[PDB]
Amino acid sequence: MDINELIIGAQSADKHTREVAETQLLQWCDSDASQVFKALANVALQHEASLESRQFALLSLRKLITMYWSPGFESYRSTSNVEIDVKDFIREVLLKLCLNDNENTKIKNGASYCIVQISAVDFPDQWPQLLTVIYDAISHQHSLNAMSLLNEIYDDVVSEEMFFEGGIGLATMEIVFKVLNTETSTLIAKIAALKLLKACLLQMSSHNEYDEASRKSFVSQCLATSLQILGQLLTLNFGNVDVISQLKFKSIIYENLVFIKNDFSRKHFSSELQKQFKIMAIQDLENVTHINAPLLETVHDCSIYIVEFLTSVCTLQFSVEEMNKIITSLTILCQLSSETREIWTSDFNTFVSKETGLAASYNVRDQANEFFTSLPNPQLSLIFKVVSNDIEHSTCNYSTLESLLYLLQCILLNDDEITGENIDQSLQILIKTLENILVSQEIPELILARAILTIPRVLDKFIDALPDIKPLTSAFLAKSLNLALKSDKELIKSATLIAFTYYCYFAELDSVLGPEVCSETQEKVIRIINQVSSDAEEDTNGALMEVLSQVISYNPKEPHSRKEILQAEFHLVFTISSEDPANVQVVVQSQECLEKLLDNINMDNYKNYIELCLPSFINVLDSNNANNYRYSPLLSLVLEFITVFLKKKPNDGFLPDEINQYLFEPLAKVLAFSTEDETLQLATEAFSYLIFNTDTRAMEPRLMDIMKVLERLLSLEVSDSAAMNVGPLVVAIFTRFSKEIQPLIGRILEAVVVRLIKTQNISTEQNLLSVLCFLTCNDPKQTVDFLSSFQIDNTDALTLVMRKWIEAFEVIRGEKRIKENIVALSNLFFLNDKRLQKVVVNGNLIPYEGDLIITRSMAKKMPDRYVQVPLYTKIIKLFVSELSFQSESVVQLLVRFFKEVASKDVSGFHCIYETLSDSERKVLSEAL
Amino acid sequence: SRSAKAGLTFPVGRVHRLLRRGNYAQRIGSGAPVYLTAVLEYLAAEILELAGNAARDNKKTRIIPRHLQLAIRNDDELNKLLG
Amino acid sequence: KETYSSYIYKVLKQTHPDTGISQKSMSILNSFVNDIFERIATEASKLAAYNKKSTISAREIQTAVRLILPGELAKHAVSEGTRAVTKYSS
């Protein structure tokens, strides 16, 4: 017999035999899958075989099932399908292995996974007896692994009809309540039942019809009995027999009590029960922390749910004695483990990611934030007094001081305002304590980082009812920045930069610190960003841009601005962004920082910045030439910076000629040769601005080079996405070269019209309409003649283009483009061309009979239909709808259009007014 | 609720409140929550239809997660939208 | 109050009267609905901050639905929305 050789060959370490056995095995399956499946199932059932072979047999069946069992698995190879006779065999073998507690855990877990796969396909059509066998094992054989298996396949197999009406729901709760009421049941047996209780509660939480009287009542007795039982379980004590098991037991009880409290009506979990379990939860916090003499992880995993319950019943009044127990217990659960202290100290980028709120980990430190952030004001005020009091007494205990400062940070993050007369006394002592921490020379690293981060919260929360707040803000901000500078810890440097962001949230440092100190803090923050930007990584570079944005926002606009700082801000925008161009958050913020560095710029100042920056840009554009301008994340970045530099033009006329001399050729080469979609989109955007904003006299010799670029973009393998910005480029060329372009307008416009008709891309048609609306404003008559004479698919372009224009009007973006198109359509309306009267465009959408949702599968027999209306009629309705949504300027424009037209009834406006809807006339009456 | 008036089975009122308390804009137009609700309802109808079709392909009368993730992957348009 | 679980059942029964949906699958679906809502909502907010306007209306949402939803979803997701805003306000 062969399967033993394959099992040994496949299980062996050497790859050569592993593939031979696997390829031989798969080849055998492709011919007699039934025989291979039968063999693997006889190798897993045989106890005489070694555990390694038995485990591997179930390990192989795990994968072979997905490939040879049913088409329901995407991995089905369709070579052969195990005969139904063989299926009934292994499906029997798997249940025997899984439901037998005497089997090894690997065999029980190995077979359990196979049943999970099979049951999701074979139940109930091909495996009717699955649940009958599982419930037989639990009820009669008292199998523990049967409850573990039943939990895994519960949601997949038991439907609402099976659960409520089918008796599976009541059958399970009887099993659950029998186990929990049996005081002699082992913890592993009670834990299994409580996990299975969570499966039932999930079924009862939501179901297809709440109003069913039989379902509504059945839920009531189940929840009422659950809370009765869960109360009994929390009263039990097992000593130190097994703390890891007891902690899991408490975890599942509180997971169930946080579900019953949150995913059910207030009726089912009353306040008197909330008070009863609130007292138990606080006492479990004391018990859980005292048990902490993988124990710690289970202590922290259990504490997440105990605190998650307290967050739910946080509205209940906490006694002063109970607040002490919560703070004392959280001070021990919210302190950083030695493992996390090492992680943060060794790599400060992990500290910044967690502090910035971007780390994926969620632990007790985050559930304590959710608890303190949820408290109401009557309790939040009293908690602060407890936390503040503990700090002034724990100031000399560095073991707990960091934890307490975090609880204080969570309290001060609450949206409610802390009030009460005594808080004035506690606050002043708290402020002095924080100052001592900063001044302390021997303070540990992470306590100092937390004190730096908590101080902004204290000032923000008590911005009012705090004398001399401004001196404190200057005193604290200066002290925290100094600590960052004279320290070799990058964690403290990044802690101060994050703290600086919090300072700017509540305080206008320009008005608080003053013109001189504000510039000094800008210098200090810029120095700190340089120090940490050297080793910044991952989410740190995103944070540094956010901080740098704040620094840039405070640079003076008044004369005698610090030119040294501005050159340092420019250097940081490129340096931080150049480090990780692919980072999206840095890319967007880098442009924002660059834009606000150029919002108001003089000629002399602008020339200096382009002189410093442009030479780097030229090299990046030229460097990518050898790569055929493929999608380099750095190449995109500079093309986005060039656009910002070119878009934010200085006052006093056009851009300096140097830009035309140096950027024109690199950009032209990018557009001529590059094939990437993103590169062409950005390059065309930058090139369009270059032509638009540069002096015509200095660009005329380059007019020929533009056309080779333009003609290469109009029609080629260049997709519609790649030629997204060709609309503005054609507008820019037409605007600055209108006299020289007169011969070439016809062939340029013809290509644009064809592109507009074919493209379904919202952004491409919006841009390509920028050419038409520009031409219509320039000469509405001429545009129609070009469209009337030109034909696509043997029909006039006018009907096709105008219909595209009308549909595109509904999704145009930007006030500039909405004003432009409103003017363009208005010019067509005033023209009253006879050819424009024969075009018919889609009006209101005719709904089909009934209320059926028309999914795309129904498009064949329920296509969208529109009432055909004359174009001029749809133009007026479109403008009316624009005024309605809005409910010199867009509204101003549409209103003057309605006034001028009404004063003369041009183009039959009187007739259109008569056929408009009554609601439209009411809106139109705002102008009339 | 306003869902019946617009012909929807999703909460028009609660989507409006979600838009307001979300601090997305200073004001929300009356036609915004009705429009966004119909879009959410349509997508839930698309996913349920394709997921349901997968269930019936296996003669199942229940949309378990396997069917749900199998439908989105096979439908490219949903695959791009929802991965 | 809202999770969309109650309404996803209602939509399912119109599309498929005899088909049920599992709790873990409905939790997955609510992730989809909520995600696409917060992706259309933020895009509509950006277009509202853009367009130099302070209001989010049908125009902003339709532009948002067309930028986000790929292909036929955008063309159909818009038909539903428009026929609803048309049945509404009438």
Distance between the termini of chain A: 95 Å
* Tally of DSSP helical segments of chain B: 5
**Biggest sheet of chain A, in brief?**
2 strands, antiparallel
The best one-word shape of chain A is: globular
Provide the helix percentage of chain A: over 70%
Beta-strand content bin of chain B: under 5%
State the secondary-structure class of chain B. mainly alpha
Principal-axis shape of chain B equals: elongated
Q: In angstroms, what is the radius of gyration of chain B?
A: 16 Å
List SSEs of chain B in N-to-C order: HHEHEHH
Number of strands of chain B: 2
Q: Helical content of chain B, roughly?
A: 55-70%
Number of strands of chain A: 4
Strand content of chain A: under 5%
Please state the oligomeric state of the protein chains shown: heterotrimer
Question: What is the number of independent domains of chain B?
Answer: 1
**Most extensive chain-chain interface:** B-C, 55 and 59 residues
Helix/strand-derived class of chain A? mainly alpha
Strand order of the biggest β-sheet of chain A: 1-2
Q: How many helices of chain A?
A: 45
Subunit structure (chain B): The nucleosome is a histone octamer containing two molecules each of H2A, H2B, H3 and H4 assembled in one H3-H4 heterotetramer and two H2A-H2B heterodimers. The octamer wraps approximately 147 bp of DNA. Interacts with NAP1.
Family (chain B): Belongs to the histone H2A family.
Subcellular location (chain B): Nucleus; Chromosome
Protein name (chain B): Histone H2A.2
Commentary on this structure:
By secondary structure, chain A is an all-alpha fold. Chain A contains 45 helices and four strands. Chain A is globular, with a radius of gyration of 36 Å. Chain B has 83 residues and is mostly helical. With 90 residues, chain C is mainly alpha-helical. Chain C has a single domain (1-90), classed as Histone, subunit A (Orthogonal Bundle). Chain C has helices spanning 5-15, 23-49, 58-68, 72-87; strands at 20-21, 55-56. The longest helix of chain C is centred in the middle third of the chain and has 27 residues, at 23-49. Chain C is globular. Chains B and C meet through helix 2, strand 1, helix 3, strand 2 and helix 4 of B and helix 1, strand 1, helix 2, strand 2 and helix 3 of C. Strand 2 of chain B pairs parallel with strand 1 of chain C. Chain C: The modification N6-succinyllysine is found at residue 10.
